[PDB]
Every structure is written in C-alpha cells, then in structure tokens.
Amino acid sequence: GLLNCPIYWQQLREKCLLFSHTVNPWNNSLADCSTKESSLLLIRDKDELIHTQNLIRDKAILFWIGLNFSLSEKNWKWINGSFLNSNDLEIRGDAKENSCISISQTSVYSEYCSTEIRWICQKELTPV
Amino acid sequence: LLNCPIYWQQLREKCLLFSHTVNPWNNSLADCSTKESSLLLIRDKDELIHTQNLIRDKAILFWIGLNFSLSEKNWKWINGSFLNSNDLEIRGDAKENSCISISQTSVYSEYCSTEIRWICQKEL
Ligand SMILES: *[C@@H]1O[C@H](CO)[C@@H](O)[C@H](O)[C@H]1NC(C)=O
Numbered sequence: 001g002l003l004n005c006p007i008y009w010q011q012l013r014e015k016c017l018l019f020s021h022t023v024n025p026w027n028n029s030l031a032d033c034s035t036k037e038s039s040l041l042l043i044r045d046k047d048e049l050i051h052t053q054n055l056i057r058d059k060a061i062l063f064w065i066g067l068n069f070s071l072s073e074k075n076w077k078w079i080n081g082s083f084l085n086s087n088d089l090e091i092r093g094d095a096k097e098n099s100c101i102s103i104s105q106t107s108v109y110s111e112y113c114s115t116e117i118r119w120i121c122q123k124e125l126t127p128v
Numbered sequence: 129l130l131n132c133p134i135y136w137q138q139l140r141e142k143c144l145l146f147s148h149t150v151n152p153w154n155n156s157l158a159d160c161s162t163k164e165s166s167l168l169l170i171r172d173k174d175e176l177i178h179t180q181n182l183i184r185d186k187a188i189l190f191w192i193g194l195n196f197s198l199s200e201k202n203w204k205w206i207n208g209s210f211l212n213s214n215d216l217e218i219r220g221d222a223k224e225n226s227c228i229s230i231s232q233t234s235v236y237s238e239y240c241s242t243e244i245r246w247i248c249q250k251e252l
C-alpha cells in the first residue's frame with residue numbers, strides 16, 4: 001500500500017526482506033518462503049552481502065540463504081538453478097553432502113541442512 | 129485490465145502458472161519460490177475440480193504443493209499443515225519419497241524424482 005514493502009518486511013535497495021523469528025531446517029525454510037510467495041535470499045555480490053548484514057543487530061544469529069550443496073555436481077547452487085559464480089561470499093567451512101549456506105552479521109558459513117536456524121526471504125522490487 | 133500477470137491464468141481468487149517443462153518435485157518448489165510463488169495448494173474438492181478443468185490434456189500430470197513427510201508419515205502441504213483430509217482421493221502409495229500430482233481426472237502419488245510439469249500460484 002503506502003510503502004514499497006509490505007508490513008514486517010524491510011526494504012534494502014531493490015528487495016523486500018523478511019528475517020524469520022523462528023527456526024527451521026533449510027528445506028522447510030524454502031517451503032516457508034514459497035508459501036509467502038517469495039524466494040530464499042539470493043545474494044548478487046559482496047556489496048549486497050554487506051548491506052544485508054548491516055540490518056542484523058545480534059551477531060550470533062545465523063540465517064539460511066537460498067544456496068545449498070548439489071552432491072551430484074559437487075558445488076554450491078542457488079535455488080534459481082545457477083551455480084555460485086564467484087567468491088564474493090567467502091564461504092567458511094566444508095563443501096560436502098547435505099550442506100547449506102547461512103549468514104550472520106559478520107560471516108557466511110556452511111552448515112548441515114538439518115540444522116534449525118532462522119532464514120531470510122526476498123521479494124524483488126526490480127528483478128534482473 | 130485483469131487480475132493476473134501475463135501468462136498466468138486466473139482461477140477464482142488465484143493466479144496459476146502451468147509449466148511447459150518438467151522437473152522433479154524439489155526443483156519445482158524451487159522454481160515457484162524463484163518466481164515468488166507457491167506450489168499449488170488445494171483446499172477442497174471444489175477447488176480441485178475447478179483447477180482440473182484448466183487441464184485440457186488427459187495424459188499430463190502436474191506437481192502440487194504436497195508431499196510425504198518421512199518423519200511424520202503423512203502427506204504435508206508446503207505451508208506446514210498436514211493434509212488431514214480424504215477430499216483429494218489420492219491414488220497410489222503413501223511412502224517415503226512420494227509427492228502429489230494432479231491430472232485432469234485424478235490425484236496421484238508419484239516418486240518425487242519423477243520429472244513432470246508443475247503448477248505455481250499467487251493469491252489475489
Ligand atoms: C541466480 O542468483 C545468483 C545470486 O543472485 C546470480 O548470480 C545468478 O546470476 C542468478 N541466476 C539467474 C539465472 O538469474
């Protein structure tokens with residue numbers, strides 16, 4: 001209505017973001033975003049990573065993003081079907097079966113996909 | 129001027145997109161999420177019937193937003209709720225690695241790896 005993003009979402013440049021208040025494994029986080037007619041967070045570059053991190057106050061909290069390990073292809077792939085195409089995220093940890101990517105205020109971590117953490121959904125105001 | 133994005137079909141209070149390509153169920157969910165949309169949710173027999181009327185080819189199956197949860201041993205929607213109903217009259221087995229699809233006439237359990245078309249929705 002009034003603002004570009006709906007109630008409870010936060011605008012950050014060309015995206016509306018929803019930071020969850022509950023926890024889920026990665027696959028349930030994806031389901032949640034879909035239910036809310038949104039995507040798990042896709043991070044275009046380092047600059048976007050840093051601006052998103054600058055919204056987070058609590059330095060200890062992890063959030064799933066829309067990237068996980070494809071075992072058959074042995075690399076990180078976004079839910080839009082693309083391979084990770086740069087090192088802008090400086091992922092910390094192992095690239096192995098049943099791993100998924102999370103972010104905190106300061107870092108980006110590989111975590112087992114069964115781990116129960118918060119998640120970030122996006123709606124694009126100006127898609128590519 | 130109409131209620132839905134270009135290529136989406138209005139049905140009652142939803143906009144639906146019927147894929148033309150195929151995918152296993154997990155990729156289908158990822159596709160809908162990428163399109164800022166949900167895999168199809170069906171509330172009851174009347175919404176099933178009306179959606180099925182949009183499918184004009186008898187062979188073709190379409191994934192919806194319903195699969196078999198292994199931990200819970202029951203059918204669960206992607207919105208978190210259990211099916212907890214027999215309205216859809218599911219044909220086939222309720223077992224690990226099974227997902228739900230729809231045809232023009234029926235509702236089928238299929239292996240989640242099966243590559244078929246899928247239906248995404250946006251609520252009006
Ligand atoms: C998928 O998202 C990633 C991260 O934003 C981006 O690098 C990539 O180009 C996108 N792929 C497509 C097909 O849009």
Ligand SMILES: *[C@@H]1O[C@H](CO)[C@@H](O)[C@H](O)[C@H]1NC(C)=O
Binds near residue numbers: 098
């Ligand atoms: C990785 O994400 C893709 C969707 O892009 C999906 O095919 C699969 O469920 C995910 N794998 C795991 C182990 O979470």
Ligand SMILES: *[C@@H]1O[C@H](CO)[C@@H](O)[C@H](O)[C@H]1NC(C)=O
Binds near residue numbers: 172
């Ligand atoms: C999940 O969607 C299904 C099918 O439309 C419906 O039965 C159920 O009420 C939904 N759950 C919630 C909380 O809306």
Ligand SMILES: *[C@@H]1O[C@H](CO)[C@@H](O)[C@H](O)[C@H]1NC(C)=O
Binds near residue numbers: 154204206
């Ligand atoms: C079933 O869907 C749920 C999301 O609601 C997800 O936890 C899981 O990835 C799916 N399982 C299979 C085998 O596709």
